[PDB]
mmCIF file of all heavy atoms in Angstrom:
data_model
loop_
_atom_site.group_PDB
_atom_site.id
_atom_site.type_symbol
_atom_site.label_atom_id
_atom_site.label_comp_id
_atom_site.label_asym_id
_atom_site.label_seq_id
_atom_site.Cartn_x
_atom_site.Cartn_y
_atom_site.Cartn_z
ATOM 1 N N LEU Y 231 3.685 14.871 -16.548
ATOM 2 C CA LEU Y 231 4.687 14.787 -15.495
ATOM 3 C C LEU Y 231 4.139 15.301 -14.172
ATOM 4 O O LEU Y 231 4.512 14.794 -13.108
ATOM 5 C CB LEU Y 231 5.934 15.579 -15.891
ATOM 6 C CG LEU Y 231 6.758 15.004 -17.046
ATOM 7 C CD1 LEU Y 231 7.531 16.104 -17.764
ATOM 8 C CD2 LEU Y 231 7.704 13.921 -16.549
ATOM 9 N N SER Y 232 3.265 16.313 -14.206
ATOM 10 C CA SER Y 232 2.633 16.755 -12.968
ATOM 11 C C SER Y 232 1.744 15.665 -12.376
ATOM 12 O O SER Y 232 1.662 15.528 -11.152
ATOM 13 C CB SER Y 232 1.822 18.024 -13.228
ATOM 14 O OG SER Y 232 1.172 18.466 -12.053
ATOM 15 N N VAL Y 233 1.085 14.876 -13.226
ATOM 16 C CA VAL Y 233 0.345 13.706 -12.746
ATOM 17 C C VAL Y 233 1.301 12.694 -12.120
ATOM 18 O O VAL Y 233 1.042 12.141 -11.041
ATOM 19 C CB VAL Y 233 -0.465 13.077 -13.894
ATOM 20 C CG1 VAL Y 233 -0.997 11.708 -13.488
ATOM 21 C CG2 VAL Y 233 -1.602 13.996 -14.309
ATOM 22 N N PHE Y 234 2.412 12.422 -12.807
ATOM 23 C CA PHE Y 234 3.438 11.552 -12.238
ATOM 24 C C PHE Y 234 3.841 12.020 -10.846
ATOM 25 O O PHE Y 234 3.998 11.209 -9.926
ATOM 26 C CB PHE Y 234 4.658 11.505 -13.162
ATOM 27 C CG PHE Y 234 5.503 10.274 -12.989
ATOM 28 C CD1 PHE Y 234 5.068 9.045 -13.456
ATOM 29 C CD2 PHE Y 234 6.731 10.347 -12.354
ATOM 30 C CE1 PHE Y 234 5.845 7.912 -13.296
ATOM 31 C CE2 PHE Y 234 7.512 9.218 -12.191
ATOM 32 C CZ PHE Y 234 7.067 8.000 -12.663
ATOM 33 N N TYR Y 235 4.027 13.330 -10.678
ATOM 34 C CA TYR Y 235 4.430 13.861 -9.379
ATOM 35 C C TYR Y 235 3.311 13.722 -8.352
ATOM 36 O O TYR Y 235 3.567 13.382 -7.192
ATOM 37 C CB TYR Y 235 4.856 15.323 -9.522
ATOM 38 C CG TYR Y 235 5.916 15.549 -10.579
ATOM 39 C CD1 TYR Y 235 5.950 16.726 -11.315
ATOM 40 C CD2 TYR Y 235 6.885 14.588 -10.837
ATOM 41 C CE1 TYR Y 235 6.918 16.939 -12.281
ATOM 42 C CE2 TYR Y 235 7.856 14.792 -11.800
ATOM 43 C CZ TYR Y 235 7.867 15.967 -12.518
ATOM 44 O OH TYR Y 235 8.832 16.173 -13.478
ATOM 45 N N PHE Y 236 2.064 13.983 -8.757
ATOM 46 C CA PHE Y 236 0.935 13.759 -7.859
ATOM 47 C C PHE Y 236 0.872 12.311 -7.395
ATOM 48 O O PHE Y 236 0.329 12.025 -6.321
ATOM 49 C CB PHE Y 236 -0.384 14.129 -8.539
ATOM 50 C CG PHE Y 236 -0.455 15.550 -9.019
ATOM 51 C CD1 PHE Y 236 -1.179 15.871 -10.156
ATOM 52 C CD2 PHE Y 236 0.171 16.568 -8.320
ATOM 53 C CE1 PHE Y 236 -1.260 17.175 -10.597
ATOM 54 C CE2 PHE Y 236 0.094 17.876 -8.760
ATOM 55 C CZ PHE Y 236 -0.624 18.179 -9.898
ATOM 56 N N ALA Y 237 1.410 11.387 -8.192
ATOM 57 C CA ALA Y 237 1.381 9.981 -7.797
ATOM 58 C C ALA Y 237 2.164 9.715 -6.513
ATOM 59 O O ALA Y 237 1.982 8.655 -5.905
ATOM 60 C CB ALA Y 237 1.934 9.106 -8.923
ATOM 61 N N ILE Y 238 3.022 10.639 -6.087
ATOM 62 C CA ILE Y 238 3.924 10.405 -4.959
ATOM 63 C C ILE Y 238 3.172 10.467 -3.630
ATOM 64 O O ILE Y 238 3.153 9.469 -2.890
ATOM 65 C CB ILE Y 238 5.092 11.406 -4.975
ATOM 66 C CG1 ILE Y 238 5.960 11.197 -6.217
ATOM 67 C CG2 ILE Y 238 5.927 11.269 -3.710
ATOM 68 C CD1 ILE Y 238 6.698 12.442 -6.658
ATOM 69 N N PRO Y 239 2.560 11.602 -3.268
ATOM 70 C CA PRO Y 239 1.877 11.657 -1.963
ATOM 71 C C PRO Y 239 0.733 10.668 -1.857
ATOM 72 O O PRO Y 239 0.556 10.030 -0.810
ATOM 73 C CB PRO Y 239 1.387 13.109 -1.883
ATOM 74 C CG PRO Y 239 1.306 13.566 -3.294
ATOM 75 C CD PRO Y 239 2.412 12.864 -4.016
ATOM 76 N N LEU Y 240 -0.060 10.532 -2.923
ATOM 77 C CA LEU Y 240 -1.095 9.508 -2.940
ATOM 78 C C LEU Y 240 -0.482 8.127 -2.776
ATOM 79 O O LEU Y 240 -1.042 7.271 -2.086
ATOM 80 C CB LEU Y 240 -1.899 9.589 -4.237
ATOM 81 C CG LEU Y 240 -3.067 8.605 -4.361
ATOM 82 C CD1 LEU Y 240 -4.113 8.858 -3.285
ATOM 83 C CD2 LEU Y 240 -3.690 8.686 -5.746
ATOM 84 N N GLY Y 241 0.672 7.891 -3.402
ATOM 85 C CA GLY Y 241 1.330 6.604 -3.250
ATOM 86 C C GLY Y 241 1.685 6.303 -1.807
ATOM 87 O O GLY Y 241 1.414 5.213 -1.302
ATOM 88 N N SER Y 242 2.293 7.274 -1.120
ATOM 89 C CA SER Y 242 2.683 7.049 0.271
ATOM 90 C C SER Y 242 1.462 6.863 1.167
ATOM 91 O O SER Y 242 1.436 5.965 2.024
ATOM 92 C CB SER Y 242 3.540 8.212 0.769
ATOM 93 O OG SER Y 242 4.530 8.561 -0.185
ATOM 94 N N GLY Y 243 0.446 7.712 0.993
ATOM 95 C CA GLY Y 243 -0.757 7.573 1.793
ATOM 96 C C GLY Y 243 -1.440 6.237 1.570
ATOM 97 O O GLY Y 243 -1.894 5.594 2.520
ATOM 98 N N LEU Y 244 -1.514 5.799 0.312
ATOM 99 C CA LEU Y 244 -2.107 4.504 0.013
ATOM 100 C C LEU Y 244 -1.270 3.374 0.591
ATOM 101 O O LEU Y 244 -1.816 2.362 1.030
ATOM 102 C CB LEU Y 244 -2.271 4.338 -1.499
ATOM 103 C CG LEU Y 244 -3.453 5.051 -2.169
ATOM 104 C CD1 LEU Y 244 -3.634 4.540 -3.590
ATOM 105 C CD2 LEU Y 244 -4.748 4.890 -1.381
ATOM 106 N N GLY Y 245 0.055 3.519 0.597
ATOM 107 C CA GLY Y 245 0.882 2.521 1.258
ATOM 108 C C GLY Y 245 0.523 2.370 2.723
ATOM 109 O O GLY Y 245 0.237 1.266 3.201
ATOM 110 N N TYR Y 246 0.502 3.492 3.449
ATOM 111 C CA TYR Y 246 0.130 3.443 4.861
ATOM 112 C C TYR Y 246 -1.245 2.802 5.034
ATOM 113 O O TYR Y 246 -1.416 1.861 5.825
ATOM 114 C CB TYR Y 246 0.144 4.851 5.463
ATOM 115 C CG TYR Y 246 1.509 5.509 5.503
ATOM 116 C CD1 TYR Y 246 1.715 6.756 4.926
ATOM 117 C CD2 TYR Y 246 2.585 4.894 6.131
ATOM 118 C CE1 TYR Y 246 2.954 7.366 4.965
ATOM 119 C CE2 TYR Y 246 3.830 5.498 6.174
ATOM 120 C CZ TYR Y 246 4.007 6.734 5.589
ATOM 121 O OH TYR Y 246 5.242 7.341 5.628
ATOM 122 N N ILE Y 247 -2.239 3.306 4.300
ATOM 123 C CA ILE Y 247 -3.616 2.870 4.499
ATOM 124 C C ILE Y 247 -3.785 1.402 4.137
ATOM 125 O O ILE Y 247 -4.455 0.649 4.852
ATOM 126 C CB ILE Y 247 -4.577 3.765 3.692
ATOM 127 C CG1 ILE Y 247 -4.422 5.239 4.106
ATOM 128 C CG2 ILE Y 247 -5.991 3.201 3.735
ATOM 129 C CD1 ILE Y 247 -5.083 6.215 3.163
ATOM 130 N N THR Y 248 -3.199 0.971 3.023
ATOM 131 C CA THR Y 248 -3.334 -0.415 2.604
ATOM 132 C C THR Y 248 -2.667 -1.348 3.602
ATOM 133 O O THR Y 248 -3.236 -2.385 3.960
ATOM 134 C CB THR Y 248 -2.741 -0.600 1.208
ATOM 135 O OG1 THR Y 248 -3.543 0.104 0.252
ATOM 136 C CG2 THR Y 248 -2.699 -2.072 0.837
ATOM 137 N N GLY Y 249 -1.464 -1.005 4.066
ATOM 138 C CA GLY Y 249 -0.831 -1.837 5.076
ATOM 139 C C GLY Y 249 -1.689 -1.973 6.318
ATOM 140 O O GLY Y 249 -1.945 -3.084 6.796
ATOM 141 N N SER Y 250 -2.179 -0.843 6.837
ATOM 142 C CA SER Y 250 -2.985 -0.892 8.054
ATOM 143 C C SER Y 250 -4.264 -1.694 7.843
ATOM 144 O O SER Y 250 -4.637 -2.517 8.689
ATOM 145 C CB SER Y 250 -3.312 0.525 8.517
ATOM 146 O OG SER Y 250 -4.122 1.200 7.570
ATOM 147 N N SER Y 251 -4.939 -1.484 6.712
ATOM 148 C CA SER Y 251 -6.219 -2.141 6.480
ATOM 149 C C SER Y 251 -6.044 -3.639 6.270
ATOM 150 O O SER Y 251 -6.830 -4.437 6.791
ATOM 151 C CB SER Y 251 -6.919 -1.509 5.277
ATOM 152 O OG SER Y 251 -6.300 -1.905 4.065
ATOM 153 N N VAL Y 252 -5.031 -4.042 5.501
ATOM 154 C CA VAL Y 252 -4.781 -5.466 5.303
ATOM 155 C C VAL Y 252 -4.410 -6.127 6.622
ATOM 156 O O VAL Y 252 -4.865 -7.238 6.925
ATOM 157 C CB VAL Y 252 -3.690 -5.674 4.235
ATOM 158 C CG1 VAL Y 252 -3.349 -7.153 4.103
ATOM 159 C CG2 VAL Y 252 -4.150 -5.118 2.894
ATOM 160 N N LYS Y 253 -3.590 -5.456 7.438
ATOM 161 C CA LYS Y 253 -3.246 -6.024 8.737
ATOM 162 C C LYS Y 253 -4.484 -6.190 9.609
ATOM 163 O O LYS Y 253 -4.655 -7.222 10.268
ATOM 164 C CB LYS Y 253 -2.209 -5.142 9.432
ATOM 165 C CG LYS Y 253 -1.886 -5.552 10.864
ATOM 166 C CD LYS Y 253 -1.146 -6.884 10.916
ATOM 167 C CE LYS Y 253 -1.327 -7.572 12.260
ATOM 168 N NZ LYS Y 253 -0.207 -8.506 12.566
ATOM 169 N N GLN Y 254 -5.362 -5.183 9.627
ATOM 170 C CA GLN Y 254 -6.553 -5.264 10.468
ATOM 171 C C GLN Y 254 -7.507 -6.347 9.977
ATOM 172 O O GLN Y 254 -8.089 -7.080 10.786
ATOM 173 C CB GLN Y 254 -7.252 -3.905 10.510
ATOM 174 C CG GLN Y 254 -8.660 -3.931 11.094
ATOM 175 C CD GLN Y 254 -9.300 -2.557 11.128
ATOM 176 O OE1 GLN Y 254 -8.678 -1.561 10.758
ATOM 177 N NE2 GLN Y 254 -10.550 -2.498 11.572
ATOM 178 N N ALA Y 255 -7.681 -6.465 8.659
ATOM 179 C CA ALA Y 255 -8.648 -7.418 8.123
ATOM 180 C C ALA Y 255 -8.141 -8.850 8.247
ATOM 181 O O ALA Y 255 -8.836 -9.720 8.786
ATOM 182 C CB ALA Y 255 -8.957 -7.082 6.665
ATOM 183 N N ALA Y 256 -6.931 -9.117 7.751
ATOM 184 C CA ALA Y 256 -6.402 -10.475 7.798
ATOM 185 C C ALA Y 256 -5.935 -10.861 9.195
ATOM 186 O O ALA Y 256 -5.932 -12.048 9.536
ATOM 187 C CB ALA Y 256 -5.249 -10.622 6.805
ATOM 188 N N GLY Y 257 -5.542 -9.884 10.011
ATOM 189 C CA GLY Y 257 -5.011 -10.159 11.328
ATOM 190 C C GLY Y 257 -3.554 -10.562 11.352
ATOM 191 O O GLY Y 257 -3.015 -10.808 12.438
ATOM 192 N N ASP Y 258 -2.900 -10.640 10.195
ATOM 193 C CA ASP Y 258 -1.495 -11.006 10.099
ATOM 194 C C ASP Y 258 -0.790 -10.025 9.174
ATOM 195 O O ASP Y 258 -1.321 -9.661 8.121
ATOM 196 C CB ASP Y 258 -1.334 -12.440 9.583
ATOM 197 C CG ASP Y 258 0.105 -12.905 9.590
ATOM 198 O OD1 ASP Y 258 0.641 -13.175 10.685
ATOM 199 O OD2 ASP Y 258 0.699 -13.007 8.499
ATOM 200 N N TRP Y 259 0.409 -9.595 9.575
ATOM 201 C CA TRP Y 259 1.104 -8.551 8.828
ATOM 202 C C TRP Y 259 1.621 -9.053 7.485
ATOM 203 O O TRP Y 259 1.761 -8.261 6.547
ATOM 204 C CB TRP Y 259 2.259 -7.992 9.659
ATOM 205 C CG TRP Y 259 3.365 -8.974 9.890
ATOM 206 C CD1 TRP Y 259 3.442 -9.904 10.884
ATOM 207 C CD2 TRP Y 259 4.555 -9.122 9.106
ATOM 208 N NE1 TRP Y 259 4.608 -10.622 10.769
ATOM 209 C CE2 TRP Y 259 5.309 -10.162 9.686
ATOM 210 C CE3 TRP Y 259 5.057 -8.478 7.972
ATOM 211 C CZ2 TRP Y 259 6.535 -10.572 9.170
ATOM 212 C CZ3 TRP Y 259 6.275 -8.885 7.461
ATOM 213 C CH2 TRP Y 259 7.001 -9.922 8.060
ATOM 214 N N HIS Y 260 1.911 -10.353 7.370
ATOM 215 C CA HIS Y 260 2.454 -10.878 6.122
ATOM 216 C C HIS Y 260 1.558 -10.533 4.939
ATOM 217 O O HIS Y 260 2.048 -10.207 3.851
ATOM 218 C CB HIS Y 260 2.641 -12.393 6.221
ATOM 219 C CG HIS Y 260 3.645 -12.814 7.249
ATOM 220 N ND1 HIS Y 260 4.884 -13.317 6.916
ATOM 221 C CD2 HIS Y 260 3.594 -12.807 8.603
ATOM 222 C CE1 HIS Y 260 5.553 -13.602 8.019
ATOM 223 N NE2 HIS Y 260 4.793 -13.302 9.056
ATOM 224 N N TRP Y 261 0.239 -10.590 5.136
ATOM 225 C CA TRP Y 261 -0.682 -10.307 4.040
ATOM 226 C C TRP Y 261 -0.473 -8.908 3.479
ATOM 227 O O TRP Y 261 -0.649 -8.690 2.274
ATOM 228 C CB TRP Y 261 -2.126 -10.480 4.509
ATOM 229 C CG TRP Y 261 -2.553 -11.913 4.598
ATOM 230 C CD1 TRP Y 261 -2.623 -12.680 5.724
ATOM 231 C CD2 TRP Y 261 -2.970 -12.753 3.514
ATOM 232 N NE1 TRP Y 261 -3.058 -13.945 5.409
ATOM 233 C CE2 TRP Y 261 -3.277 -14.015 4.059
ATOM 234 C CE3 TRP Y 261 -3.112 -12.559 2.137
ATOM 235 C CZ2 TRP Y 261 -3.719 -15.079 3.274
ATOM 236 C CZ3 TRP Y 261 -3.550 -13.616 1.359
ATOM 237 C CH2 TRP Y 261 -3.847 -14.859 1.930
ATOM 238 N N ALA Y 262 -0.088 -7.952 4.327
ATOM 239 C CA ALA Y 262 0.179 -6.603 3.840
ATOM 240 C C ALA Y 262 1.248 -6.616 2.755
ATOM 241 O O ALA Y 262 1.162 -5.861 1.779
ATOM 242 C CB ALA Y 262 0.602 -5.700 4.998
ATOM 243 N N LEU Y 263 2.262 -7.467 2.906
ATOM 244 C CA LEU Y 263 3.298 -7.602 1.892
ATOM 245 C C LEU Y 263 2.900 -8.540 0.760
ATOM 246 O O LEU Y 263 3.560 -8.533 -0.284
ATOM 247 C CB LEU Y 263 4.597 -8.100 2.532
ATOM 248 C CG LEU Y 263 5.278 -7.148 3.517
ATOM 249 C CD1 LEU Y 263 6.466 -7.831 4.174
ATOM 250 C CD2 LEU Y 263 5.713 -5.864 2.827
ATOM 251 N N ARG Y 264 1.852 -9.347 0.938
ATOM 252 C CA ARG Y 264 1.416 -10.265 -0.108
ATOM 253 C C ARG Y 264 0.450 -9.623 -1.093
ATOM 254 O O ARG Y 264 0.444 -9.994 -2.272
ATOM 255 C CB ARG Y 264 0.752 -11.498 0.513
ATOM 256 C CG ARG Y 264 1.686 -12.352 1.355
ATOM 257 C CD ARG Y 264 0.916 -13.374 2.177
ATOM 258 N NE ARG Y 264 1.746 -13.997 3.201
ATOM 259 C CZ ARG Y 264 1.301 -14.858 4.106
ATOM 260 N NH1 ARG Y 264 0.031 -15.227 4.145
ATOM 261 N NH2 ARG Y 264 2.152 -15.362 4.996
ATOM 262 N N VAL Y 265 -0.365 -8.670 -0.639
ATOM 263 C CA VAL Y 265 -1.394 -8.098 -1.502
ATOM 264 C C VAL Y 265 -0.767 -7.206 -2.568
ATOM 265 O O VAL Y 265 -1.111 -7.294 -3.753
ATOM 266 C CB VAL Y 265 -2.427 -7.328 -0.660
ATOM 267 C CG1 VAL Y 265 -3.320 -6.477 -1.554
ATOM 268 C CG2 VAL Y 265 -3.260 -8.293 0.171
ATOM 269 N N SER Y 266 0.157 -6.335 -2.166
ATOM 270 C CA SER Y 266 0.700 -5.358 -3.105
ATOM 271 C C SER Y 266 1.414 -5.999 -4.289
ATOM 272 O O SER Y 266 1.190 -5.544 -5.425
ATOM 273 C CB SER Y 266 1.635 -4.394 -2.362
ATOM 274 O OG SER Y 266 1.036 -3.929 -1.165
ATOM 275 N N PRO Y 267 2.265 -7.016 -4.119
ATOM 276 C CA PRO Y 267 2.907 -7.621 -5.300
ATOM 277 C C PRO Y 267 1.915 -8.101 -6.343
ATOM 278 O O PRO Y 267 2.142 -7.906 -7.544
ATOM 279 C CB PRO Y 267 3.708 -8.783 -4.697
ATOM 280 C CG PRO Y 267 4.009 -8.344 -3.315
ATOM 281 C CD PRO Y 267 2.801 -7.571 -2.864
ATOM 282 N N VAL Y 268 0.809 -8.716 -5.917
ATOM 283 C CA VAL Y 268 -0.202 -9.167 -6.869
ATOM 284 C C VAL Y 268 -0.714 -7.991 -7.688
ATOM 285 O O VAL Y 268 -0.894 -8.093 -8.907
ATOM 286 C CB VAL Y 268 -1.347 -9.886 -6.133
ATOM 287 C CG1 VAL Y 268 -2.512 -10.145 -7.079
ATOM 288 C CG2 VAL Y 268 -0.846 -11.187 -5.527
ATOM 289 N N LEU Y 269 -0.957 -6.855 -7.033
ATOM 290 C CA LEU Y 269 -1.329 -5.654 -7.770
ATOM 291 C C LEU Y 269 -0.192 -5.211 -8.681
ATOM 292 O O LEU Y 269 -0.424 -4.790 -9.820
ATOM 293 C CB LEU Y 269 -1.707 -4.537 -6.798
ATOM 294 C CG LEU Y 269 -2.809 -4.871 -5.789
ATOM 295 C CD1 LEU Y 269 -2.830 -3.855 -4.657
ATOM 296 C CD2 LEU Y 269 -4.164 -4.943 -6.476
#
């Protein structure tokens, strides 16, 4: 359960970072919402 709880801050940080990186690489924000569902 402590691992489950650690999943929270890493989850939020990864959300921010993945959104920003996908937007920068693809150049379009839609891809940020397209990559995560596949995962």
Side-chain angles (χ1 to χ4, degrees):
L231 291 154
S232 179
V233 168
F234 203 73
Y235 306 147
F236 302 148
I238 296 154
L240 183 63
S242 315
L244 282 192
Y246 295 125
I247 302 167
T248 292
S250 64
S251 74
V252 176
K253 174 68 204 205
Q254 167 179 357
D258 185 73
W259 67 274
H260 296 252
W261 282 100
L263 294 174
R264 296 168 193 176
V265 167
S266 313
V268 170
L269 305 164

